[PDB]
Design a protein around this ligand. Sequence first.
Ligand SMILES: Cc1nc2c(NC(C)C)nc(CCc3nc(N4CCCC4)nn3C)nn2c1C
Ligand SMILES: [Mg+2]
Ligand SMILES: [Zn+2]
Length: 313
Amino acid sequence: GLMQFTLPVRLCKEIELFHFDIGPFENMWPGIFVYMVHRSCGTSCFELEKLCRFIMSVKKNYRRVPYHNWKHAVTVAHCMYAILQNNHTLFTDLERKGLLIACLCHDLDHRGFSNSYLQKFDHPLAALYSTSTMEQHHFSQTVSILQLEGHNIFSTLSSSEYEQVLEIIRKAIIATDLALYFGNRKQLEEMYQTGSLNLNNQSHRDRVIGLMMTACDLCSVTKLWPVTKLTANDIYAEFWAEGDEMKKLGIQPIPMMDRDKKDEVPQGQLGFYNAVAIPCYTTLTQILPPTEPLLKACRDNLSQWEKVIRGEE
Ligand SMILES: Cc1nc2c(NC(C)C)nc(CCc3nc(N4CCCC4)nn3C)nn2c1C
Ligand SMILES: [Mg+2]
Ligand SMILES: [Zn+2]
């Protein structure tokens, strides 16, 4: 009850910044997450015993893949934390409760393959879920874990508040399907510019939380250059293993997933920052001004990839 989580001083100060890296000590990630729940939501939000039990079962259901692993889950939750703490009054009590959980759960049981690889392999998940295949799975694993004995962290909520939080979590997790991001971001841009954006309209909030989800999920591009550059190694280790798996099905992979195009990485990062990342954090900053440091950091990393191309890096 009287039991704060505290972090060493450097982590206490730096966890509040958008560019914070959660570090290589796996055993501290649970405490970092509880710390973020306790400050962004409250000591009262969840029973400590249930939360801890929930975090450890969530961790167990992330696999030992190079990028889509437990570190990625906690990284994506910390970016959400920083967004929430910089936009104190913009969010409901339920949203505060739902979104850090959504972020921790958003890639549950990821195998290191894209929706498109499951569809070409003809994985059973692709017949259960014909679009957003992996994301419907992640939401289904979230509900499974919420239903284990002693794991219902939302038990203090009314039946209808419980339904609303599971509904914030579902939409937040589905939104991490980047195929959906392009259209979400365009509609948000149009709505912001024609002044129709209305945060009291639930379908508008949903879109804005969707974009937050993309922003957190891509937050590898918003770190200190050394973190950005080394995370890209992990990202490509997955993509290229998928490439190999595509060639085993007799399919030339897209160049993103072809290890033979190693040498083009700097230029692939450029297109990605111009086509995906910069537009994401640009539109996010328009809607939520205090998130501008994510845009500044993204722009800084774009400029570092340009240096790599010019032979200065
Ligand atoms: C956070 C993060 N998320 C992603 C991401 N997410 C995908 C689901 C689109 N993709 C990439 C790779 C982007 C890329 N590389 C290349 N090639 C590499 C040499 C041939 C072409 N082409 N593209 C488009 N980086 N990345 C980061 C850093
Ligand atoms: Mg995902
Ligand atoms: Zn993710």
